[PDB]
Ligand binder design. Structure first.
Ligand SMILES: CC(=O)N[C@H]1[C@H]([C@H](O)[C@H](O)CO)O[C@@](OC[C@H]2O[C@@H](O)[C@H](O)[C@@H](O)[C@H]2O)(C(=O)O)C[C@@H]1O
Ligand SMILES: CC(=O)N[C@H]1[C@H]([C@H](O)[C@H](O)CO)O[C@@](OC[C@H]2O[C@@H](O)[C@H](O)[C@@H](O)[C@H]2O)(C(=O)O)C[C@@H]1O
Ligand SMILES: CC(=O)N[C@H]1[C@H]([C@H](O)[C@H](O)CO)O[C@@](OC[C@H]2O[C@@H](O)[C@H](O)[C@@H](O)[C@H]2O)(C(=O)O)C[C@@H]1O
Ligand SMILES: *[C@@H]1O[C@H](CO)[C@@H](O)[C@H](O)[C@H]1NC(C)=O
Ligand SMILES: *[C@@H]1O[C@H](CO)[C@@H](O)[C@H](O)[C@H]1NC(C)=O
Ligand SMILES: *[C@@H]1O[C@H](CO)[C@@H](O)[C@H](O)[C@H]1NC(C)=O
Ligand SMILES: *[C@@H]1O[C@H](CO)[C@@H](O)[C@H](O)[C@H]1NC(C)=O
Ligand SMILES: *[C@@H]1O[C@H](CO)[C@@H](O)[C@H](O)[C@H]1NC(C)=O
Ligand SMILES: *[C@@H]1O[C@H](CO)[C@@H](O)[C@H](O)[C@H]1NC(C)=O
Ligand SMILES: *[C@@H]1O[C@H](CO)[C@@H](O)[C@H](O)[C@H]1NC(C)=O
Ligand SMILES: *[C@@H]1O[C@H](CO)[C@@H](O)[C@H](O)[C@H]1NC(C)=O
Ligand SMILES: *[C@@H]1O[C@H](CO)[C@@H](O)[C@H](O)[C@H]1NC(C)=O
Lengths: 314, 169, 314, 169, 314, 169
């Protein structure tokens, strides 16, 4: 009586501790190369920001009007998105983005500032609604008449909630030192801000910038997180963009950046710009910046795991 | 191979044993035969299967962006990030390659191991009633009929009731 | 003659490369779960800062009076600790904390600034000693009379030591622009500072802040490290909190944050907020932010290592 | 098992061998016996012990805080820190799980290995004076008395001075 | 017939999973300890900056005159190097260094600013060429006469190239408030700067600093990267050091810091301050901050890999 | 050793076998002999060589400075950097030590394995014409001359043409 093992005409080559390209009976892949070029979002509350930039949801340019109080498990940023209508930017912007990406969405709350002896309805052709408008959640505070002085004002807001309040204000940098005076009067304009946690202050910087949206003025956007029962004071004398509403975070979410479509027919937890990595495999060679719950990124294109014995044909 | 069989004092495998991994082939009077041992073929399959289920593995560890692909973060923090990321990639590429090599080596050796277990167990069924050819075949000194074959395969062959006859020979 | 191996009625289940929950004769744990809820400090010079905040040891609020020149192998920060008596904070605070945590303690040195034509004895009800006082290592420089001007002064300090000198100064931000003048006179107040390594400058920011300790004024605290034989210049015209003494680091230590008690009856090198991880095991599932010399943190609660053969009962 | 014994052509273990890991059990005239081989039991124990001392291991690498639990560091640097920390945790959780599995596999196989060494060495003490039962027992064809048993155990049994007698049988 | 294996009188001890210091027939090292104390640069375009600091190649102190437009695969910084002739430093300096280290060198382009109604030829004894000079790529803009006013100027530069332009400007901080006026007139001096990406502004800070190079004045150096077809505006009124030429990156390189010599007789990709690690070994115990393509740094001095069987002598 | 030989029922090695790793030593009439098996010695050498070429390995992953040795970067980012760097060092020091230990264990066992393959193959060349001494030597019951030795070594020894003679004995 004779015994033996099976074999095949064509084996699969694998690598071992000692040998390179030994043929085994059967093998199976261990590195995922297959991408699905869509954002598989089946079962998830998804918000596709489109033209609305993430940071814009807090301030309110027209493109963000339908996103002022969104709610999501999954937040998608798009290259076409913009945080701004009137030219400007956020100081410490990416920190804020990371916060908003996992906020699970936002909830808005009037801070209840009232004004006495100034203007309040600043607008621009960059923010198009009716006609000229402004940031929905903000207020452009002027001086009552086409020149004037600005009264050193002091507003305060207490966070009456059990969660930290996202406070955002703005600083306006006019084209000229002339323009600055036509809006808030002459002089050195000062904005000071404090909490039980925060210590800072701001002065404007009038001067000509490149024309963006048609304008050479800019707006500095600044932000801080007010802890429960802590209070924020705004000491200022012009060039000030005031928060109307404060923001509160809803819970928990994931934020990605993508150029592909949403698909509610496929499910996945591993996302990158080009789509979704659906896989059971422990590794992937698709995108090292993939986020969510992913197989480990590796450099190798392929790593075959032996699922059978050495293949020995006659 | 770590156990000397499967390329091996057994010089090759059978591209016809499509019924299992390990098997018996016998030459006697009544013609010719070739079967498959299930218990050996299964133990190996169940061991390889165990590796599979262990490696096809899901992390429940979520990771978020610390980077920006539409608007680049500040260079310094950016370079630390990439430096870190690349370092971790090196570690995982290393882990992955080693893991797979280590596993393939062991997969192969246990496949070799299972063969040796089968052989060295049949050999023990056939005490002095047979002797070793050395190519994985057993020379029978009492001409087992096909029923005497299945007695070996199904592990019931008698350890003395062919003996002194086969001992004479 | 027959041979065999041993076995038991009850085995311990382990995991292998191929099999999950196979029983072996004996096994032993590999992940530490047992915490000792004390700071095991046997044999170590320990400083428990209590109500004194780490950064306060450099400036000197009353709660830090017994910590102005401490010496330690192990530094413990407490949630109740405060860096401040008069409301304010440190610019670049956490960097400084990390420095002080491994300084092995500090040593103080008079910088020998003398003053001509100003006041020098500023105080407050926030800093309680005799009655109203101030930061022990600092000096609140005023204008001679309840209004006045401030003479543009220039002090310098040379580090005559073989180790870098920790220099700390302060900027005062008054409640009003009125208050700023009552302390240092009217005008734009400027503080400039330089070394062979350092280039910066500071202007105050008067305005109302929330009331902390009873006060709506703040103090900015700033710091730099003066290398041996390098020199620091202070150009200023008011709103200035001057360093009296400079600090020098003693050697080497470890700093932790904890809410548990010190225990000089147990020894350990692996610390976290909840106590001490005493273990020989290579891994731990207690606290991923554990510091000192620790087994690796892992996610798994348990990982049994086989110390015997497969258990096969009849 | 990688070496075919210990579950095994040996079908199970002895919950009575409290004296060691491996041992001899004999049936003869003078009653019944069961002892323990020290040299086998010790070699295995010393090998397992070696693993223990190698893994129960102390780093002399100190780590300090880069984080703050009373007063949170700035968000961006905070997120990089956590991201890094979590990445390293993934690597160590992975290393730990693999290490232990790899080690348990080998621990088991060397335990199987030691049994096979014992057997295959006794078998060599008893050349043709005995033959293999196949369950790890040896059929003696010259009725070894208890003294002849301890001759095997203590590794002094004679390789020819029971021979032709046991060969007759 | 008898069989056996080989053995030797003296074996090499190795470590295994189970055993420590077992002797094998042959072994081989796995950790590299051997350093070559030179910068092995065979086959590579190398630039040894010597006394020229990396950042100086952009601005142009005299020691950088032969490096204004260098081209390299390998850039070497030297401890003796300096970025500066007139005392000052770069804001965000190390980021810029990292950029320049892998730029593959730089290429300069006139930005074509013209001036009307000011001076332009500022110099100093710190920048020695003919006699007193300045930074080659920069221009020290004054007020026409030994006092005067500075006209609020507005220059702009558009990046007409397919690559980002490295823009550098300077802010001058004079010894006195008197000196500031003698150079640019009295008043608050403002510099504002913007792109499609950038929002910032600057005010000087006159005051006495320590004497460096003989001088107590400093120069702030600032920089930004202008994307293709994006435009940069400079709004300013004095205390301004203007860029003459913009810089463009050539391609790709590696930058190191070293105190050893260049050697074009040896090749290597793994570099550290003390030289070059030439090795095939997977690990190294020489320098954990080694850069380039290196074996992994490990803590162990030695790790012997068995290349033979157990050594058993009689 | 995992395969029971090489220290071993073979009690030691030969410091004279400078010709190879594994070999035959024979005592007969015509004097004394000692040779080397190439095919065994080669298979082991080629396996060890395979490990070498796999580990002597080049990364194509470039790393740049994120640190400054002439002018220290800001403390906070500095501490994160060092913290990260030290963490990665821990991982690589760990990987390196484990890799080498794991490999040395296996190197040794496969060396033990190859010996057992050689033996257990010669044993199969000499069916009943010889029996096992137990120290790795084979007692010949038909006095093989030197030509009969080289018949075994070169793997051509006859499996029956010394048989019944050696069987008589
Ligand atoms: C509240 C307010 O003052 N809104 C103005 C706005 C501001 O003055 C300005 O944005 C601040 O810097 O200016 C706007 O008109 C400016 C517009 O003027 C044209 O003459 C010019 O050709 C354009 O380039 C552009 O600057 C605006 O619409 O935002 C007007 C607005 O009412
Ligand atoms: C050196 C000095 O001026 N000390 C003052 C201090 C400073 O003026 C102030 O802290 C700077 O902003 O003011 C203190 O009294 C202030 C105290 O006044 C009460 O009228 C008021 O009700 C309180 O809220 C509080 O502001 C102080 O004690 O610190 C007085 C101090 O002498
Ligand atoms: C463009 C210009 O003004 N160049 C001056 C320069 C500047 O005024 C100064 O660097 C700005 O702060 O000053 C220099 O001379 C200064 C020189 O004066 C001696 O009297 C003094 O003893 C020295 O310490 C030193 O300050 C200079 O050479 O840089 C002159 C220069 O022409
Ligand atoms: C080959 O391997 C894969 C592993 O998943 C398995 O599904 C398949 O059954 C194998 N093929 C054969 C012919 O056994
Ligand atoms: C805030 O104030 C309310 C009312 O006094 C109180 O119920 C709540 O506990 C406070 N929150 C904190 C944490 O200060
Ligand atoms: C970081 O890595 C990405 C690719 O993963 C690369 O495109 C990018 O340029 C890197 N960051 C920097 C600072 O260049
Ligand atoms: C079980 O394992 C541990 C390992 O440390 C050991 O101390 C103990 O002796 C073992 N128990 C038995 C019954 O051997
Ligand atoms: C500082 O000055 C003293 C006295 O000149 C000198 O001994 C010392 O070397 C100097 N230190 C340095 C490093 O400049
Ligand atoms: C970092 O991790 C800790 C727990 O380890 C978590 O509590 C904290 O929120 C994280 N940091 C940030 C930025 O939230
Ligand atoms: C010892 O090991 C090294 C491994 O590179 C090898 O080059 C050398 O041939 C070996 N020496 C002997 C005596 O075989
Ligand atoms: C810059 O302008 C030129 C001329 O209009 C054009 O060819 C080029 O595409 C522009 N580059 C970009 C990307 O704006
Ligand atoms: C970082 O590590 C280096 C050595 O690798 C050390 O000299 C340096 O002091 C460390 N950095 C800091 C912030 O001290």
């Amino acid at each position: 009586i004779c015994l033996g093992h099976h074999a095949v005409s064509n084996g699969t080559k694998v690598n071992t501790l000692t040998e390179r390209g030994v043929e085994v009976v059967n093998a199976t892949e261990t590195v995922e190369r297959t991408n699905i070029p869509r954002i598989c979002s089946k079962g998830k509350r998804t918000v596709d920001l489109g033209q609305c930039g993430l940071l814009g949801t807090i301030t309110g340019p027209p493109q963000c009007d339908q996103f002022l109080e969104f709610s999501a498990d999954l937040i998608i940023e798009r290259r076409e998105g913009s945080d701004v209508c009137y030219p400007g930017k956020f100081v410490n912007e990416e920190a804020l983005r990371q916060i908003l990406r996992e906020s699970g969405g936002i909830d808005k709350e009037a801070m209840g500032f009232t004004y006495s002896g100034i203007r309040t309805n600043g607008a621009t052709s960059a923010c198009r609604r009716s006609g000229s408008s402004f940031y929905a959640e903000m207020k452009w505070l002027l001086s009552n008449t086409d020149n004037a002085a600005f009264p050193q004002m002091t507003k305060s807001y207490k966070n009456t909630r059990k969660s930290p309040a996202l406070i955002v204000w703005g600083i306006h940098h006019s084209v000229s030192t002339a323009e600055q005076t036509k809006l808030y009067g002459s002089g050195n304009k000062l904005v000071t801000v404090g909490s039980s946690n925060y210590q800072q202050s701001f002065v404007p910087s009038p001067g000509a910038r490149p024309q963006v949206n048609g304008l050479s003025g800019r707006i500095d956007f600044h932000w801080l997180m007010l802890n429960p029962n802590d209070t924020v004071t705004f000491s200022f004398n012009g060039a000030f963009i005031a928060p109307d509403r404060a923001s509160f975070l809803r819970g928990k979410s994931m934020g990605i950046q993508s150029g592909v479509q949403v698909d509610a027919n496929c499910e996945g937890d591993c996302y990158h710009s080009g789509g979704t990595i659906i896989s059971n495999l422990p590794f992937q060679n698709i995108d090292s910046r993939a986020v969510g719950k992913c197989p480990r990124y590796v450099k190798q294109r392929s790593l075959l795991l032996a699922t059978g014995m050495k293949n020995v044909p006659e | 191979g770590l156990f000397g069989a499967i390329a091996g004092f057994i010089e090759n495998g059978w591209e016809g044993l499509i019924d299992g991994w390990y098997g018996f082939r016998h030459q006697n009077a009544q013609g010719e035969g070739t079967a498959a041992d299930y218990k050996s073929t299964q133990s190996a399959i169940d061991q390889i299967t165990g590796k599979l289920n262990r490696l096809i593995e899901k992390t429940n560890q979520q990771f978020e962006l610390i980077d920006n692909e539409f608007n680049e973060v500040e260079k310094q923090i950016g370079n630390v990030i990439n430096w870190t990321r690349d370092s971790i990639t090196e570690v995982w590429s290393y882990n992955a390659e080693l893991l797979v090599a280590m596993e393939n080596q062991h997969t192969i050796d246990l496949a070799d191991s299972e063969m040796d277990k089968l052989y060295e167990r049949v050999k023990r069924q056939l005490r002095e009633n047979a002797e070793e050819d050395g190519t994985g075949c057993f020379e029978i000194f009492h001409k087992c009929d096909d029923d005497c074959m299945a007695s070996i395969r199904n592990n019931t062959y008698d350890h003395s009731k062919y003996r002194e006859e086969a001992m004479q020979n």
